[PDB]
Structure formats: structure tokens, C-alpha cells
């Protein structure tokens, strides 16, 4: 029922690596400070996403057993999960508690950022559904590791090796849900069910980016590699 000493060790380690990410307040302070044009917002997004990928690779190489995986499978896991982990981190930031009226302004700033109207509704639907789950930092960190270590990712040669690494993380997450939320018996299932929406964002990520209301869609060389752009 309770976490074993090894599981407690795993969770603390995962949590320390996850906290190396750009602080949510740094991101929200910039967005809330002043209104930017769609052009300026697209550059903000590419700079934020480039830093996110850099930190994500560092978090990924620290996951137990990741560095023992086949090199081609390592690349396929990073490429298959980057967009998904980016949207999950965005959802985490969006739902972070802020002073009175600040969350409404943050949502208004994202709504008028430059993203096409067609993609605002599913993005905000996902953000609000994540918010309703009232996830802890541990849950976000474990869910991110689970997303990265997905065995059924495209071009994976050895799925069993990936399965073996994902399973102890799934086990820890399930225990946390049972311990901290006995009143919500479907909490674990709902966290995993939320991953299907993340996969839909990954499926249309290129169209979402190319539909931004800007004259030129300039991407960093790192984003060109991880995303299906240019």
C-alpha cells in the first residue's frame, strides 16, 4: 500500500531532476507584465520551448535505466514525447496558484497570443481538465517520466526494455493516488486517460505552430529536430 524505501528513493530523485526546469513564476511574470504582439509571442514560445527541450533531455538521461537503452530508441523516445511533455508543463504552469485576478489575465494573454482560434478551445479544455485533477508536483513529475518512457512510441525497436523502465514509475504513481486520494478511486486512471489528449496535440503540433498569426515561422535548429517543422 505504502511506498517501499526503494520507491521513496525513486520519487525523491525524480522530483529533484524535475525541479531543474524554468520556474513557473519566471514564465507567468513575463506574460502578465505586458501585452506583446503575435510576432513577439511566437519568439517567446520558441525561446521557452528550446529551453524546455534542453532541460527535458537532462531530466530524461537521469531516468533510471534510460542511458542503458539502445541509442536509436533513446532518440525515438525524446522525439515522441517532447511536445507532450511541453503541453503537460504548460498545463502545470497554467494551473499554478496566482494572486486575485492574475489567472484571468494569464488566460486572456494566452487566448490573444497569436494561436489560431481552432486550437485555443482544445488547449484550454485540456488545461482546465488538468486543473480539476489538482495534481501535486510529484504527480506532474511522474506523469512526465511515464510520457517519456512510452513503449508504444513510433520506431522503438525494443519495447520490452522501455516497458521495464516505465513500470516502476507507474507503480509509484498508482500508490501515491491511493494514499493521497482514497476519496477519488479513479484518480490514477484519470491521470493516464489525460495522456490520450496529449497524444492528439502531438499529432497536430506542426499545424498548430504553422497556423500562428505571424508572417514568418522561424524555429531554432534544436526545435527543427525535435518538432515536424521547416
Amino acid at each position: 500500500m505504502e511506498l517501499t524505501p526503494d520507491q521513496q528513493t525513486l520519487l525523491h530523485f525524480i522530483m529533484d531532476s524535475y525541479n531543474k526546469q524554468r520556474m513557473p513564476q519566471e514564465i507567468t511574470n513575463k506574460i502578465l507584465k505586458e501585452a506583446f504582439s503575435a510576432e513577439e509571442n511566437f519568439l517567446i514560445l520558441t525561446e521557452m520551448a528550446t529551453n524546455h527541450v534542453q532541460v527535458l533531455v537532462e531530466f530524461t538521461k537521469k531516468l533510471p535505466g534510460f542511458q542503458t537503452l539502445d541509442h536509436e530508441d533513446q532518440i525515438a523516445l525524446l522525439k515522441g514525447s517532447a511536445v507532450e511533455a511541453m503541453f503537460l508543463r504548460s498545463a502545470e504552469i497554467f494551473n499554478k496558484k496566482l494572486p486575485s485576478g492574475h489567472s484571468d489575465l494569464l488566460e486572456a494573454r494566452i487566448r490573444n497570443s497569436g494561436i489560431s482560434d481552432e486550437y485555443i478551445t482544445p488547449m484550454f479544455s485540456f488545461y482546465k481538465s488538468i486543473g480539476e485533477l489538482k495534481m501535486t508536483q510529484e504527480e506532474y513529475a511522474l506523469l512526465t517520466a511515464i510520457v517519456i518512457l512510452s513503449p508504444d512510441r513510433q520506431y522503438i525497436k525494443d519495447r520490452e526494455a522501455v516497458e521495464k523502465l516505465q513500470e516502476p514509475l507507474l507503480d509509484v504513481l498508482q500508490k501515491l493516488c491511493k494514499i493521497h486520494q482514497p476519496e477519488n478511486p479513479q484518480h490514477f486512471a484519470c491521470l493516464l486517460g489525460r495522456l490520450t489528449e496529449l497524444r492528439t496535440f502531438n499529432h497536430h503540433h506542426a499545424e498548430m505552430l504553422m497556423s500562428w498569426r505571424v508572417n514568418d515561422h522561424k524555429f531554432t535548429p534544436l526545435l527543427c529536430e525535435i518538432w515536424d517543422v521547416q
Binding site: 534542453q54 533531455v57 541509442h71 525524446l78 522525439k79 534544436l222 529536430e225
Partner: peptide, 12 residues
């Protein structure tokens, strides 16, 4: 080709 990703993975 994914040379930047390969570099970030193989470094250190």
C-alpha cells in the same frame, strides 16, 4: 538527421 539531439544525449 537529428545531430543536436544525439549530441545532447551523448555529451558528459
Amino acid at each position: 538527421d537529428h545531430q543536436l539531439l544525439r549530441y545532447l544525449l551523448d555529451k558528459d
